[PDB]
Amino acid sequence: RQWALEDFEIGRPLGKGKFGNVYLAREKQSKFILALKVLFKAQLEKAGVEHQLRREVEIQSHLRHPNILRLYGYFHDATRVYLILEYAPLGTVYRELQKLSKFDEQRTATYITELANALSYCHSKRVIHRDIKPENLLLGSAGELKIADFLDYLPPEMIEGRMHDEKVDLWSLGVLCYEFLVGKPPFEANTYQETYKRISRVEFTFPDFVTEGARDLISRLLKHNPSQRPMLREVLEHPWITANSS
Ligand SMILES: C=Nc1ncc(F)c(-c2cccnc2Oc2ccc(NC(=O)c3ccccc3Nc3ccccc3)cc2)n1
């Protein structure tokens, strides 16, 4: 409960980014094996996100799920800040997606279920999410997927703030599923302008090898109007999902 850097025996550099570096680590006390991010407050300031982090570490800490990367604890010295995190032994879905180019109908559906499961929990524990990427998806030991993200003159459209923020994740789920099945995201193009074009006008096209159940689901998630995309529950109960999830 009262953490210091010499409570930890340090292993191999696990990669860097963005403010800090991650190392492999072990609790001298419980010999428990975990990752450790090392953020520098100097690097947080020249990016103005010190309070933003502390804010989110308090949110993160109260999220226990097999499909969400577990944060165990945190601490600091004057120069450095440390985050004690679940080591995902099997690499990212990015690296793996490059190794396999695309995934099988079942590998994709299982991954969607897990995401959906995790996202539902967040929605339930009152914490909505923005965008999910393959690069932000880590892999546990048993192939399991881990989200590792980080007046009186005022009108109605300014006091109701952000109306539909819950529904972004369903778009993300649509996009992801596609990339998993195809190897590329659905509005990927050459110019940034042509990508912007296809995202705005919702312009994606399934190559022939894609199944119907997938085309059906993906289309339902990728609706222009946010309030038309299925609620997470429905994704878990989709013919295609309920036929490949395990
Ligand atoms: C190879 N497996 C593996 N396992 C665990 C790992 F952490 C990593 C890893 C290695 C190198 C770089 N990144 C890695 O993954 C992550 C992914 C997410 C995080 N999460 C955070 O850094 C974070 C968690 C809770 C709260 C805040 C966090 N960061 C944050 C920083 C600034 C502002 C806001 C949030 C940490 C490491 N890699």
Automatic annotation (TrEMBL):
It catalyses: L-seryl-[protein] + ATP = O-phospho-L-seryl-[protein] + ADP + H(+); L-threonyl-[protein] + ATP = O-phospho-L-threonyl-[protein] + ADP + H(+). GO terms for molecular function: ATP binding; protein serine/threonine kinase activity; protein serine/threonine/tyrosine kinase activity. There is a cross-link at residue 133 (Glycyl lysine isopeptide (Lys-Gly) (interchain with G-Cter in SUMO2)). It is found in: Cytoplasm, Cytoskeleton, Microtubule organizing center, Centrosome; Cytoplasm, Cytoskeleton, Spindle. Its EC number is 2.7.11.1. The active site is at residue 131. GO terms for biological process: cell cycle G2/M phase transition; cell division; meiotic spindle organization; mitotic centrosome separation; mitotic spindle organization; positive regulation of cell cycle process; regulation of microtubule-based process; regulation of signal transduction by p53 class mediator. Residues 8-241 form the Protein kinase domain. Coiled coil: none annotated. ATP binds at residues 18, 37, 86-88, 135-136, 149. It is an enzyme of class 2 (transferase). One of its GO terms (cellular component) is microtubule. Keywords: ATP-binding, Cell cycle, Cell division, Cytoplasm, Cytoskeleton, Kinase, Microtubule, Mitosis, Nucleotide-binding, Phosphoprotein, Serine/threonine-protein kinase, Transferase. Belongs to the protein kinase superfamily. This is non-specific serine/threonine protein kinase. The chain holds residues 58 to 320 of 335 of the full protein.
